[PDB]
Amino acid sequence: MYAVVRLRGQVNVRYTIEDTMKMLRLHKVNHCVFVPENPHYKGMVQKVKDYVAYGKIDAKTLAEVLENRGRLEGDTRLTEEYIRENTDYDSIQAFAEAVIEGKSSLKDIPKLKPVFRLHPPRKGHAGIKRTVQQGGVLGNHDENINVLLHKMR
Amino acid sequence: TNSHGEKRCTRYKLQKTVRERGISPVSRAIQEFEEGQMVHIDIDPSVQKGMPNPKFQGSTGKVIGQRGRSYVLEVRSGNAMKEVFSLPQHLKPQKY
Amino acid sequence: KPGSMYRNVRQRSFTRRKYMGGVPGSQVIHYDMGDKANTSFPVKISLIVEEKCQIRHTALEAARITANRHLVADTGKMGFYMKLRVYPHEVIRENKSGMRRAFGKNVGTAARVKPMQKIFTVAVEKQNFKAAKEALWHAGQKLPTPCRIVVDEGAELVQ
Amino acid sequence: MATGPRYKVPFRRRREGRTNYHLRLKLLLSRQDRVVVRKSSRNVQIQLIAPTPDGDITYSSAVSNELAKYGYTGATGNTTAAYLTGLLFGLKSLQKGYEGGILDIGLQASSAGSRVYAALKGVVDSGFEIPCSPEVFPPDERIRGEHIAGYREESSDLPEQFEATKEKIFAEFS
RNA sequence: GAGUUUGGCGGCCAUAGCGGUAGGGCAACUCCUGUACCCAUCCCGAACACAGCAGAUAAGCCUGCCCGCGUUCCUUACUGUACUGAAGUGUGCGAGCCUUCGGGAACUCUGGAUCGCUGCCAAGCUCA
RNA sequence: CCUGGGGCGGGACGCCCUUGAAAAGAUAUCAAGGGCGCGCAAUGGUUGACUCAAGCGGGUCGGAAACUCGCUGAAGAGUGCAAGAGCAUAAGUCAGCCUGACGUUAUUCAGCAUAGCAGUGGAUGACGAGACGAAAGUCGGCUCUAGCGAACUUUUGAGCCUCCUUGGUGGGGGCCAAAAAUGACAGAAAAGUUACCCCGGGGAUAAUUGAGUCGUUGCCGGCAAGAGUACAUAUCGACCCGGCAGCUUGCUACCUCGAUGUCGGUUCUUUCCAUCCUGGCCGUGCAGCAGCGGCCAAGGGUGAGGUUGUUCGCCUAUUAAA
RNA sequence: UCCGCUGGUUCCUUCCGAAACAUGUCGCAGCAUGACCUGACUUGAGAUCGUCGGUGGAGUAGAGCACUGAUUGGCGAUUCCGGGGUCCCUCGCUCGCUUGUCAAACUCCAAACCCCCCGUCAUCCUAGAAAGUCGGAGUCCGGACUGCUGGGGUAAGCUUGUAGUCCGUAAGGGAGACAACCCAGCCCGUGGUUAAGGUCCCCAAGUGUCGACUAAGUGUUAAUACUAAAGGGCGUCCCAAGCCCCAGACAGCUGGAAGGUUAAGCACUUCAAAGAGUGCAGCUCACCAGUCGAGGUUUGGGGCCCCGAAAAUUGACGGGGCUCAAGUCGACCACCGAUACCACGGAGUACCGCAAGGUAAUCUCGUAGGAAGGCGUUG
Ligand SMILES: [Mg+2]
Ligand SMILES: [Mg+2]
Ligand SMILES: [Mg+2]
Ligand SMILES: [Mg+2]
Ligand SMILES: [Mg+2]
Ligand SMILES: [Mg+2]
Ligand SMILES: [Mg+2]
């Protein structure tokens, strides 16, 4: 499961890349979306590598992301009670485990927004002018996206 | 000044490869096409009759009718739909 | 007309001489110097250019003259074989008024050379290696590019 | 002599001198079956052919080797044998369900009173429909085989056996 | 019901061409035999056309072979080189060039293969 | 009218092909190569029969120049003419027969991508007539892409409608089609001059200063080919290559046209050093005197006169130098 | 009078928001038509800005000589068409084998982007897809940055194109100032954390950490119209490889350059140790012996610095100043720092709902201009 977070703005960005972002539902910086691992989404995330950061999120990171930055319709925070009344699992942690194990989805939750408006990264990040392999933050973090997601908790 | 003729800038659009120059395969000229079938426009430069523009070279046309030997194609040129008359020698079916 | 004018490579290749008019030919006379028959020279070195530059035919002729004279005075007339690999194929045209109808007349030819492309190849004996290398050093001083010498044959024969 | 990579070899049938492709393109535009009449030096053969992109397919055929079973004994490569083969092909193609087709002599030269036009007249006389002009048809005595008196008296069996084969084949297919 | 051979019509139009050697025809094909006639020569029955008993597989044709030339394909190296899509507070005085992620040759080289594949119909034979 | 200001020149002012043009399409410049304003009753159509250019070989003064036979020959020829594309049992050549180089009419293309836009073409068809051919087919000219022109007016072709109450006669008006041209080619019937000039605007655009650039100009450097009796480097420094200055002329059009008073001189002040003299050194092919070349150095000096409006330059006599 | 030319054209808010381009024009300072913007209406279910896979178009970069043309030698023959001192024989073209270069009007080859169509995912969509009709315009002086070695040009803050994004019409934060360079697209107030960039002082936060380099005040200048080259350096710091090398080299200190030759040196039989010879006929090196007693020399590829390097009012790393840095390089840590992001409260807008009200990550910038709603004067 790619965890794609936007880290650069929409100024001086080409229309194809900006529409790629818009179909990914990433209109502003510090916005995260969780998407499956099919080749279609892999190509879409590859097209916007210079303006986002993506990786393979683990279950604990997604659990804390749902617990601290999940919003329903009307801008209402997600909690444990809504999860238990609209899913089969014991808490947000078990639902995150199910989502990582592929037998669940984020669309299982009724009314849940597909965009996680995250906080800016605590103690900054590595920079938006170099990729991950150049010492920056853009591009593919692999499993190290969870460190960046943790610092943007 | 430059010209505005129909064959303008078709040095390689309307050129045949070295080992397909000469007579073409005659089976390409009797390929019947159905209504609504998608066919590729790949112009045969040897057949000088019933040819579309070079500007439609490489466009997929939907067959909508027949006008004798040639076929009626609904071709797309940028943002407009065009009706392009082409004989079967210049068309080629799309395979799935 | 200094070589800095017709030096940088920012234009496409103007070489089809059947669609142009009256190119003044190159002053470069020969392209082989020394022993043109002995293929048994063990130590072979080449002068390579490390930029993308257009060498005028007059520059090539001056470099060839200095290198050939140094090699003839160093290793004798038949103790070396020196090869100028590149022909000047590009036609250099100057806008000889103002900028109206600016496509100029041909005022000479030149050779467009890529980075690391060998200009002169020199084949010499073991003892005449230093003289050939130093003459090739003098040859590149008459060229518009930074040039470094590279050894083709007998790298172990020298060191 | 394919001297280099810029050498365009002809098509395989054209390399073998067996097919003209310009005439083939002219004939295939009809969208009709071709009466592909081919004559060999010792007998004659006629086919009905319809093209498909996998290759040509032949519906019906008839050669001079079939004339033995209908009571024919003479030469199988003359005008009379060509007429009998054409008549048999026409009746057999009518029986199978084919009654039309354009003539196709291929690379063989066109000349009136040939074996090919004799086969064409045999096809026309069997009820098979093929557009043709009667000028290129042979005379009736030539189809009967009235050449015989010039050289050989053993050729005199030709007209009676031709009439016998004609009546036998007409009774056979009708 | 199946197979081999032969013939006609082909499809893909060199992997099929160019070249060299070795084998075969019962049926077939061809070479080959004549010119009464049909037809014909810008002259020649050379071709075409007609009528064909022979004789010959010497050629057409079929089978196998030779990498020699051409083509096609793989393969190791060149090489993830050339070139390039995107981004870059990376870099050069400058013509420019570099890093990251994603594509990716051509020539040549090593070791090999390719001297066609296949579709229809018919004539025969040999079915189990 | 376009126009690296205008003018002179030119027509990139209409049509056609290759590149430019960055492998769909489009894409400008006074961009590069150019061409067209026609020719042809056959140099056209169709059927049949053949294959061309150029080599090698054989044939008699028929020469290495003719015509003829064999072999190689996918095209290296020809197809009327630019360029590009097409074509070999042919889109070529020859011969038989012919006139489809036919009357009428509908679509869609492309001139004019996307996306409106004239008369025109150019590809499919349709009605009616034919030509050649066994038939399939081919023929709406000459293989495809240039060879041409609105409205009005006149003339001409076939048959019809019409002219003011009605019928006729002469004569007009009209429909459809063809010809006559506007080349500034989407169509004025069209020469200059103004320093006697006027007006409205323009830094949308030039002389002007300024800015950018540096071909050219001034001053240099590298490598040293050599001359210097010998000796590259005391002195001169070819060829080739790389620069600096912006002090000459150019290029450009960024600022200024509701004005930045435009050359030269004079007066006065200042600045740079790439130093002419004065000060200090180094080399010499420096004996001294006097030169020659180079380095440091901008404190001071660098004048008076003849011609010319001059800058510049020459000339005169002084002068440390002028 | 007329003018396509100049100047001016008077209140507020809200919604949306361009074009400086094509064709024709006595057209080039103008206009029309189309693209682009806006408002309304009809229509009724799909649309493609994006991804992945496939059927197709490639003829550009690159590459190469297989065509068209150029281009360099060598080797062997054109017994022939040709040039020269019994056509005795010289001999340049021409044809093959092996080399050396090319193309914008070359291609046996040949990408990455890209374009048409199909399937899938994705997004938009009955709160109205694509299509259609009508009302209103503005607009056809554009310019810049990053690429295309774009074309031309000696170059140009030059001129003319193309793809994307900007300024025009773009705030706020930062580069010293900066139309278009980076963050960022922005309703109001508060709190927090970050972006770009910076942390010696001017100035909030580092006289921060590790490992080296620079000795020149070099530098303290991302992009750039704002930044000097060729050439050279036994300046200094590295990597690698030849050669001599504790059977004792390199550089210094002791005996000799004695046989020879005056072949007028400077126009050997055989010895470890002496030439047809380095130098101001003795005056001097190359060379063997001894000697301290250990590295020496050559070449190639790199980093920084230096010479090359001269301009005009006194002056510009932004200034002060800075030397194991306050400079350069390879990494790292913590903090500072926006109106961005998060949160809270509030306003407006869009659509839906009968209404209460509901939704908005997928609403809030704005020139020419379209549309809507209001304020004001006089009657
Ligand atoms: Mg004018
Ligand atoms: Mg007067
Ligand atoms: Mg190239
Ligand atoms: Mg920008
Ligand atoms: Mg904007
Ligand atoms: Mg700003
Ligand atoms: Mg407005």
CA distance D142 to D114: 10
Helix (H) or strand (E) holding D58: strand D55-63
- The answer to whether the Cβ–Cβ distance between B18 and D51 falls below 8 Å is no
**Residue C60 backbone phi and psi in degrees, to 5:** -65, -40
Beta strands in A1-75 (DSSP E): 2-6, 31-35, 52-55, 71-72
| Residues forming a β-bridge with B94 | none
- Strand F: which of residues 38-67 in chain C lie with Cβ below 7 A? 56, 58-59, 61-63, 65-66
Sign of torsion, CA A126 A129 A133 A135?
negative
CA distance B10 to B33: 27
Chain B and chain C touch, per 3+ beta carbon pairs within 8 A? no
CA distance A63 to A123: 22
The DSSP-derived string for D131-165 is: ---GGGSPPHHHHHTTTTTTT-SGGGGHHHHHHHH
Distance A87 CA to E26 C1' (A): 87
B16 Cα to the center of ligand 3, angstroms: 22
| HSE-CB for C154 with a 13 A CA cutoff | 17
Nearest CA-CA partner of D24 in C32, B82, B25, A10 = B25
Please say whether the beta carbons of D149 and D110 come within 8 A.
no
C125's tokens = 């004996």
> From the CB of residue C87, how many other CB atoms can be counted at a distance below 10 Å?
13
D142 at interface of B, judged by CB pairs closer than 8 A: no
Count of CB contacts below 8 A, B vs D?
A: 29
CA distance D56 to D112: 29
Q: Collapsing DSSP states into helix, strand and coil, what is residue B54?
A: helix
The edge-to-edge listing of strands for the beta sheet with B70-77 is B80-86, B70-77, B60-67, B38-41, B91-93
**Residue B65 backbone phi and psi in degrees, to 5:** -175, 170
- Show contacts of D5-10: CB within 8 Å, 24+ apart: D5/B18, D6/B18, D7/B19, D8/B18, D8/B19, D8/B20, D8/B21, D8/B22, D9/B19, D10/B22
D151's tokens = 């050289």
| Residues forming a β-bridge with C124 | C43, C80
Q: Provide CB contacts within 8 A for D160, sequence distance 6+.
A: none
Residues of B in contact with D29 (CB under 8 A): 29-30, 69
Distance D43 CA to F244 C1' (A): 100
Q: Which residues of chain B from 29 to 68 reach within 8 Å of chain D, CB to CB?
A: 29-31
CA distance B73 to B43: 14
Q: Provide CB contacts within 8 A for C16, sequence distance 6+.
A: none
Distance D29 CA to F104 C1' (A): 28
Max distance between CA atoms of chain C, in angstroms, equals 61
Look up residue A17 and give its DSSP letter: H
Residues of D in contact with B30 (CB under 8 A): 28-29, 31, 51
Q: Collapsing DSSP states into helix, strand and coil, what is residue C41?
A: coil
Alpha carbon distances (Å) from D87 to A124, C146, D78, D81, D98? 97, 91, 14, 10, 14
Unique residue bearing structure tokens 């045969």: B44
D31 at interface of B, judged by CB pairs closer than 8 A: yes
A12 Cα to the center of ligand 6, angstroms: 15
Q: Provide CB contacts within 8 A for C12, sequence distance 6+.
A: none
Alpha carbon distances (Å) from A6 to A22, A77, C31? 11, 21, 61
| HSE-CB for C132 with a 13 A CA cutoff | 32
Residue D120 falls in which region: left (phi positive, over 0), alpha (psi -120 to 50) or beta: alpha
Please say whether the beta carbons of C41 and C145 come within 8 A.
no
Please say whether the beta carbons of C64 and C71 come within 8 A.
no
CA distance A147 to D33: 76
| Residues forming a β-bridge with B38 | B62
Indicate if CB(B93) is under 7 A from strand F. no
Indicate if CB(D113) is under 7 A from strand F. no
Distance C30 CA to G94 C1' (A): 23
Give per-residue burial for D102-114: e unless 16+ CB within 10 Å, then b.
Answer: ebbbeeeeeeeeb
CA distance B18 to C120: 39
CA distance D170 to D52: 33
Unique residue bearing structure tokens 């309307």: B14
Any idea what the Cα angle at residue D96 is, between residues D93 and D97, rounded to 5°? 85
Please say whether the beta carbons of B35 and B49 come within 8 A.
no
- Strand F: which of residues 89-128 in chain C lie with Cβ below 7 A? 97-103
Chain B and chain D touch, per 3+ beta carbon pairs within 8 A? yes
- The answer to whether the Cβ–Cβ distance between D28 and B22 falls below 8 Å is no
Nearest CA-CA partner of D45 in D55, D36, D56, D57 = D36
Q: In this complex, which chains have at least 3 CB pairs below 8 Å with chain C? A: none
Q: Using CB atoms, which residue from B21, B22, B31 is nearest to D53?
A: B31
- The answer to whether the Cβ–Cβ distance between B18 and D5 falls below 8 Å is yes
